[PDB]
């Protein structure tokens, strides 16, 4: 119903201009963990009314990697501030 349009409008918390930009890179890793619960909820509304009885273990497992994923990504974001003190995505040295 309208309970899916909101929330499919709320999947646009990626929006890629604000998925790596601008600086204070913690603001970009924020919406990477906040892009979940637009997948954790959008799955949970579908498994639950339509009684699948078995696929509802999948929303439990959906958090378990994305927590461990983002925790890894947060380890490296200390290493960019361990060498500097500021994350500041307009750091660029290795050209392309």
């Amino acid at each position: 119903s309208m309970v899916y349009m909101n929330i499919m409008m709320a999947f646009t918390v990626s929006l890629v201009g604000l998925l790596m930009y601008r600086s204070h890179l913690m603001s970009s890793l924020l919406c990477l963990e906040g892009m979940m619960l637009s997948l954790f909820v959008m799955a949970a509304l579908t498994i639950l009314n339509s009684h699948f009885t078995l696929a509802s273990m999948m929303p439990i497992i959906l958090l378990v990697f994305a927590a461990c994923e983002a925790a890894l990504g947060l380890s490296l974001l200390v290493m960019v501030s361990n060498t500097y003190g500021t994350d500041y995505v307009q750091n660029l040295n290795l050209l392309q």
């Binding site: 890894l72 960019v80 392309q96």
Partner: protein, 344 residues
């Protein structure tokens, strides 16, 4: 450190098996999730501040390219609820599928994943490990194959060699020259995938061999093209003759065996009354050869071995499985009447 370096390295290929051994979209999500978890240490090993500022440019590019895939699963969860790996039953899903997965294999859009990582990682040693990540999603496009829009998979592939070609004539750093022409050899195989999706794997198995044998040749000292001069008269002059043979083979010249794919792959591209499509690409990989000529014009013509430094000692690296690579990567063109009946 030594034992845990295997267990990290072992699970990289264990991540990609579950991608292939699966009948269920949840397991192919886990499959190259943990590959993006177990590559990040290999980027690091000597802790240099470009490498830390390179894997983090590697990282989030393969976090979103992960994340759109799970979006593509949950759309056709709503439509008919089957989770076998097959056609995706929705054009709004398959469109979001193919150009999500085009970042991990990086095509011509989703551009600078390929040069900005591979350049300047102080681990130039290998980084042959970037052949698994070209191998996992190709094992996903073998099944999804009869559900695509046929325009997007070509438009990412017609742009592939036209922009992977031009990108590297303006280079010296031979890691970038290996990083370039790695989009180009992803251009020939996905231009064919809608038409008879085997005789795609023929191009891939050739591409693993010819690229793996290129890096093993590079592991004496070689960093830059000017350093590729100063080992003919110093290290071994037989190395200069070998490094000529593979490049001239990888350009696609018919006395060698990099002409083995194209010769066969046009047997499939026409026979389907599509003629203006191969004639564009076949003339496009011609200035993919002007990398290699003008690279062979460095080492094979004695271009200035100055700064007298003698290597009066022998060499003891490990050139593992090297004696059998330029004997199946050059001389196989007569001996393959059917490689495409073993692999088929």
């Amino acid at each position: 450190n030594p034992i845990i370096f295997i267990i990290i390295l072992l699970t990289i290929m264990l991540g990609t098996i579950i991608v292939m051994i699966s009948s269920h979209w949840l397991l192919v999500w886990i499959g190259f999730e943990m590959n993006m978890l177990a590559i990040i240490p290999i980027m690091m090993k000597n802790h240099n501040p470009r490498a830390t500022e390179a894997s983090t440019k590697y990282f989030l590019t393969q976090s979103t390219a992960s994340m759109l895939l799970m979006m593509a699963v949950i759309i056709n969860l709503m439509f008919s609820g089957q989770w076998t790996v097959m056609k995706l039953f929705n054009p709004m899903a398959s469109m979001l599928m193919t150009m999500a997965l085009a970042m991990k294999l990086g095509m011509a859009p989703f551009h600078f994943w390929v040069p900005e990582v591979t350049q300047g990682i102080p681990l130039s040693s290998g980084l042959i490990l970037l052949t698994w990540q070209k191998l996992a999603p190709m094992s996903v496009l073998y099944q999804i194959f009869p559900s695509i829009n046929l325009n997007l998979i070509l438009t990412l592939s017609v742009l592939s060699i036209l922009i992977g070609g031009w990108g590297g004539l303006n280079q010296t750093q031979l890691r970038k020259i290996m990083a370039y022409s790695s989009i180009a050899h992803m251009g020939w195989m996905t231009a064919v995938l809608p038409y008879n999706p085997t005789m795609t794997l023929l191009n891939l198995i050739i591409y693993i061999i010819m690229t793996s044998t290129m890096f093993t040749m590079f592991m004496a000292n070689s960093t830059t093209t000017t350093l590729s001069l100063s080992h003919t008269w110093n290290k071994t002059p037989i190395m200069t003759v070998l490094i000529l043979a593979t490049l001239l083979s990888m350009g696609g010249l018919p006395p060698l065996s990099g002409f083995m794919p194209k010769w066969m792959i046009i047997q499939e591209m026409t026979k389907n009354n599509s003629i203006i499509l191969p004639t564009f690409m076949a003339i496009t990989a011609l200035l993919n050869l002007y990398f290699y000529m003008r690279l062979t014009y460095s080492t094979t013509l004695t271009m200035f071995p100055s700064t007298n430094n003698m290597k009066m000692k022998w060499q003891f690296p490990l050139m593992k499985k090297m004696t059998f690579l330029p004997t199946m990567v050059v001389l196989s063109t007569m001996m393959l009447p059917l490689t495409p009946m073993l692999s088929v």
